[PDB]
Design a protein around this ligand. Structure first.
Ligand SMILES: CC(C)CN1CCC([S@](=O)c2ccc(CNC(=O)c3cc4ccncc4o3)cc2)CC1
Ligand SMILES: CC(C)CN1CCC([S@](=O)c2ccc(CNC(=O)c3cc4ccncc4o3)cc2)CC1
Lengths: 470, 469
């Protein structure tokens, strides 16, 4: 059982005593601070609201547990038992908080307000920043979704250039990251963020998350195909790699199948085994059931180029309408080792220079997609901008002398469209002057209830590339 | 609920059809593959065993759920329903798997077997690698614990050099990482791994995990102190930073308290506010209740040194027996911005060069401690090394031509002490020759039961530094 009284940074337990006396409102906001990655995909808050923040989240038992834990943790009694009891008694354990947010899937330039948080009861001034820790973890799905979308932009550009269309784009970057993330929960969140942009995943945890918290019209949001791992090749013994290959493509003769081919010698596997010994089993396959060859070691670009070079001399290559080389439809490649946004760029550029179509290849990305990310990439940050003390509203902010990049926004915030149709965040309550039309934030949480939410299909629509919008 | 049939990489659903016919045994192992970080702390497996693998993990409903999902996910019927139903009927849904592992907390050189996995029923040859995905996630607590321990070695060396002892060492790197990790579950796992080495954390999730899965003699494994955040300073208004400081140190007058001091101008705050206006509230404080000044921006080394220089001129500094400068006991500093293992090293070395004792400072680390880590750091990897097919055991391995670093081990493995007291992994069942003493791997899981468990106290003892032994 999750306990929201135990789901904050320790020192926040002590903050209720530190605010100015007679403070009745604390108002805070989240942004991806301006400091590559010029725009972010807002995704993941809905999960957090539903899983952790909504409904009766305070009980007598949870207050006692927190009391006992913090007594030992601080070696002193500093826990606000009275504040939490108030919430329990007055609101039946529902949080007196109002959260406003940009729609999920929205693509927003850095430095804009993405959501705001304030208490709805003066007694709970301390509650706003108590839940900072939980809410700031939204950085992760935001960052995965953003970085995934940036990779889609690269793939789209090169696919359009070398093929003339975007067919297959949504399956070109496949989530291989399940084993390479830090936990089961992270796997689900991160996989779901990748599926904002793509439809290929092996991280099954993402499907369940999406079904429970977002929903899609389709039965599932993402797909995979049968494929070998090194163990199903190596188990046959070093002298029987060909036997393994033959068994596997025969077992999966009418559906796509990927076979990792670098257990011993990738170049030999491609040229002699696939290219000669088992060639007859490949050229007989359907366009809907290709063999996908998977190299998995060596320099990613050099290895991809060599594999294509080998296959191109053993199989009938065509030249598409753009002048780029294309493997026959029953044969494709996937590079699933060492792929991140940088190496992805290097490989597609290298292929283009060697006149190979991006139609030939798909990418699998694990740690690079889901784990090699931090809060510093987009500078996702939660800050207090407005308080009311003794009935007087004050615009508040930090502004460190040695780092102007850490300056925060002042006052009540709102998000607007400019006359040119761009986004602008108004500070100091200036949204109230109505010179910039209506606030684009929506109330998504209020007093323990989720008041607005988005289907995964809507989120996908919101996150589309301009070139997909055409 | 969690469903183990849905907790694997999708393609593993199809592997049961791909192994050699007549395969009755698949035996696999985990190592932090060799090619910095020469030894690793083995920690975290016990969590995974208890939370995800033990007991009745297969039910009729979970099989049906998996069957339904994979039908749509693959747009095909490829799911091994028969294999999972067998486990349900024969073993009441308990996994016919045996896992042997080195004791948690053990510090083991890279490139050694840390645990092995094998099926205990011939019908479940496919199950060994089904659970690769979930077991490989042990990379994370291993890597957090290892990287945290490596920072402890740095702090230990410089503390010993500048002070002559290791007093306070276990509180010198504090977990600030709760907001900076990817999930609530990750927070708990990562925080608990840091606590293998240290006793300071603000990531409360770690305490609950340790209490539930490991256990300690003491009430809690980790501790914190009251402290301000920027919002409790800035809420007072720009012109009232001094009023904020005064209120907070007075509220917390007889316990340690940290106050973030860089909201507007850290140098002004130290020299004029702490150093003059409120100096009388600081010099009156107890040794057991210092003020801890927290800078939080600018170049970490440059800012620490400037803060110390300012404070050194406003407060009485002593020179300890090693010749290093020491702030009075009622005043300390914590640097909690931009700290990772590299910058930690830069700061303590910079301090030493400027004749400041490491006694003066503690470090807070968030993203650098719990999030800026990947499976590539220690090359944590799970590989099949032994199979039985047609009643014959075969030693198997990968050995990619273009990367010898990815070669895997052959055959049945065991971990042993060398005559010099180091570690060695014996391959090809050679441990059976009994020339190397007893296997250091113990059975920790068998047929759905956890068979050997460690307390957090035991793990801490195993992970101790030499310098404190
Ligand atoms: C209508 C079709 C022809 C369309 N076509 C689209 C591109 C895909 S793309 O090539 C691919 C290939 C293999 C897989 C299956 N998963 C692993 O192979 C896999 C997981 C994994 C985890 C960790 N480490 C390695 C891994 O490999 C998943 C997508 C193929 C199907
Ligand atoms: C007997 C005593 C004198 C011993 N002494 C040992 C060194 C500690 S070390 O200096 C410190 C200071 C402040 C805190 C409290 N936590 C934040 O200040 C804190 C969290 C956090 C999260 C994310 N971002 C920023 C954060 O700051 C925790 C340890 C102090 C006490």
């Amino acid at each position: 059982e999750f306990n929201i009284l135990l789901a904050t940074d320790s020192y926040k337990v002590t903050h209720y005593k530190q605010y100015p006396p007679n403070t009745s409102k604390v108002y805070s906001y989240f942004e991806c601070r301006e400091k590559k990655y010029e725009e972010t995909v807002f995704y993941g808050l809905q999960y957090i609201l539903n899983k952790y923040l909504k409904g009766k989240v305070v009980t007598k038992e949870k207050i006692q547990e927190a009391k006992d834990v913090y007594k030992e943790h601080f070696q002193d009694d500093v826990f606000n038992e009275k504040g939490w009891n108030y919430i329990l008694e007055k609101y039946d354990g529902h949080l007196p908080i109002e959260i406003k947010a940009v729609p999920e899937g929205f693509v927003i330039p850095r430095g804009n307000v993405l959501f705001t948080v304030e208490n709805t009861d003066p007694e709970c001034y301390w509650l706003t920043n108590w839940i900072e820790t939980i809410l700031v973890q939204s950085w992760y799905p935001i960052t995965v979704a953003t970085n995934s979308r940036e990779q889609k932009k690269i793939l789209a550009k090169y696919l359009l250039e070398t093929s003339g269309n975007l067919d297959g784009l949504e399956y070109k970057l496949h989530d291989f990251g399940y084993r390479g993330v830090s936990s089961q929960e992270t796997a689900g969140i991160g996989a779901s963020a990748h599926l904002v942009n793509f439809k290929g995943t092996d991280t099954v945890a993402g499907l369940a998350l999406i079904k429970k918290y977002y929903g899609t019209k389709d039965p599932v949001p993402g797909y995979s195909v049968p494929a070998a791992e090194h163990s199903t090749i190596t188990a046959w013994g070093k002298d029987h790699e060909k036997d393994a290959f033959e068994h596997i493509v025969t077992q999966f003769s009418s559906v796509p199948v990927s076979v990792v081919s670098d257990s011993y010698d990738i170049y030999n596997a491609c040229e002699k085994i696939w290219g000669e010994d088992l060639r007859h089993l490949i050229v007989s396959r359907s366009t809907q059931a290709p063999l996908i060859i998977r190299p998995d070691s060596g320099n990613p670009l050099d290895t991809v180029l060599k594999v294509l070079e080998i296959l191109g001399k053993k199989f009938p290559v065509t030249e598409n309408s753009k002048g780029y080389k294309l493997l026959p439809p029953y044969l494709r490649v996937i590079q699933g080792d060492g792929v991140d946004i940088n190496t992805l760029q290097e490989i597609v550029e290298g292929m283009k220079q060697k006149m190979w179509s991006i139609e030939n290849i798909a990418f699998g990305s694990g740690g690079g997609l889901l784990q090699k990310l931090t809060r510093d990439l987009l500078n996702c940050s939660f800050k207090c901008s407005y308080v009311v003390t003794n009935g007087l509203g004050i615009n508040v902010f930090k502004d460190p002398v040695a780092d102007p990049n850490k300056r925060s926004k002042k006052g009540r915030l709102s998000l607007h469209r400019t006359p040119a149709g761009n986004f602008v965040t108004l500070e100091e309550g200036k949204g109230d002057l109505e010179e910039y039309g209506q606030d684009l934030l929506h109330t998504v949480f209020k007093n323990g209830k989720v008041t607005k939410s988005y289907s995964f299909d809507e989120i996908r629509k919101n996150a589309q590339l301009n070139i997909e919008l055409e």
